Symmetry: C2
Amino acid sequence: MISLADLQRRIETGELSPNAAIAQSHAAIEAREKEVHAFVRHDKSARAQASGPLRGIAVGIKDIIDTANMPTEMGSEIYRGWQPRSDAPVVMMLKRAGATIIGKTTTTAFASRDPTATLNPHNTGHSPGGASSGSAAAVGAGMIPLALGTQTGGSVIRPAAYCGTAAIKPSFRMLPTVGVKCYSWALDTVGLFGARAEDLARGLLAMTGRSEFSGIVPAKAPRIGVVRQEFAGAVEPAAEQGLQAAIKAAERAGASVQAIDLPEAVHEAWRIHPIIQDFEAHRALAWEFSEHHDEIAPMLRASLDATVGLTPKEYDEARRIGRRGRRELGEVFEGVDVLLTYSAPGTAPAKALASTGDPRYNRLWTLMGNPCVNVPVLKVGGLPIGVQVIARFGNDAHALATAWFLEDALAK
Amino acid sequence: MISLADLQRRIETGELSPNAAIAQSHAAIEAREKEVHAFVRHDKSARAQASGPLRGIAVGIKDIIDTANMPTEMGSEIYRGWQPRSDAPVVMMLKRAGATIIGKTTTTAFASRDPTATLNPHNTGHSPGGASSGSAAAVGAGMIPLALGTQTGGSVIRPAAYCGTAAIKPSFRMLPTVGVKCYSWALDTVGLFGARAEDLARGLLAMTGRSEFSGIVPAKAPRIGVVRQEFAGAVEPAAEQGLQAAIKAAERAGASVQAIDLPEAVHEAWRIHPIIQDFEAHRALAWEFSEHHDEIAPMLRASLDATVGLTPKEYDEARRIGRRGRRELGEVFEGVDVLLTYSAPGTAPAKALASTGDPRYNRLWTLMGNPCVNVPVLKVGGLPIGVQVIARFGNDAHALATAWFLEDALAK
């Protein structure tokens, strides 16, 4: 994988030229696209900008995010050739910082469960996960140092884990979702993919100009609370193997680790995530569902068809439950700095199963809003397994610092 | 003005056909549009639907709200001829209920300060208010029974007041802002314009399907708390004259009225509204400000130019102050059912002043999120003056019921 931080450092000291950096990404993309198919479109003419912390940094954009110079097809035939008039605010944050928008990465239809043609860089016979399939795959295949994605259920953390990349789903609403195709407004959160936690930090610093992302360093002796989300069902062996490997490394590195069972109120918040997501999806995709029903990809079409009956009454109750969940979760952080859990059910599913994987271990956190970071841990049968680092809402900086500490711990 | 509730009843009994009702609206628009200029586009071919609670109901849509069959030009040359692919969810809520989207109403450029060419129905020498200029003017001129607008500062309540129409800015996020050009995501709220409170109730019921809007009837002897928002400075005589008249009519109607102060935390929230608004505006309109700076309307261009320096730091501090204001505002509703305040600084400004009016008496409530309803009270010099009825967050029904009460109390 390509390190954004590495590129920045070399460019800053004149050790590497921005044009060369971009030329390298263009080459890396063409080198494996026929194998991975992570891009909807690759703008071969894209060049490095003259100034800014991200000059020479190529970025892939999940195709539900508006771009003014390239189509934004939403992973759906309904939006074939669709061309937004403007670049989404998050795209502008990148451009204003000097980044190069190198292309649009594949997204499942309307960012839901329908598989794209993208394949896992670690094993082409397996899924790269979803819904931010192309962003995870491209970074995983070493095509680009940074990519934007989004998460409603688990579209940032899960594919990052499957493809072995670092990634972060920042605190809810920190990054604007303006110009980002809506699935569920109560959940949709923009996310970033990169090689390591530090790359994610440098990316957010450039995009937001927030001091909290400047000068971040690996955390020391972090207080970690391990939660296995039992309510989320039975996890696969490989995932537990990764979690144990992470716990052991952290302990050896000086961290204090304790196991804890999440409150019943949090269990409930996890249970109703689908109610909030689907009730809102019917409103957010109302036009598509009413005027182009049969054109909506199968799996999403089915999920919507099964939920046309969700009522405003149960929706409100589901939101009440979410609020109770956030309140009791906050209390949990009184004794620990971060929570550590699974990033996915296990290794990436074989493509033959026609599944981008189950977001059951990701969804709760998207609703809680906390910043989540995937830390690649190990590989089983050649397939990546990661762990998810979660900090208090609004403490994205600490989540990254702890993820960094964890990466170093695993490296010994 | 045309009453949505009235049309609903006559259509329901068969007294009026949906086709005739829609023909009525087209004719009404044609009768005054040449002098009011409330529409960016009047779809003369718009026809009535055959079923649904809103069949036969014509609706005007503020032009920052996406429509798939008509352009959405944002009141800006930058989006001249721009055609969204989909109808915004709120538009779909109307269509699914059987409504007819009769046209796009004028909006100030990007829903800010720059005046449109629309004129006040009561006196064409005056402003119809803004930013939802056309929606207020069209309803005020008796062209249509309903219209959608939005409010970031006071774009729903103020123009309704100026044009003498009923209007409501529902609780924050009750109506989705998907497909609604973003100004400030922390503030933007969709609103409705109608003849009377009952019309708004019926409109929301059909759009949301929430039982809270079903069976609404005038409130009885409500407990009203009068707040003059002293932090926003003294209002013009006309506005105070209308407030005094409302209080008196309410008391004689059996309501208990008491002058109340607002917690300091609430005053502070009003003060920092501009910080949240302008900081987010720079992110929300990044593409426009960076690539089409000189094409942005003069007044908005100047406001943006003057706020480029707002920092993420002061922004976060502003949001913290906002949250505190919301919490403490709730306390105010422990002894009162609704608050009664000004809807605008006074009568509509003369067009010559090149101003849609100061939103100072509206902005606080948009940040707090509470449902607000404008109740026409009287006219000074032939210009309408109204009052603003405000209930607890999530208590939209009560706001409408109390507004209906006030309407009946004024009619004596």
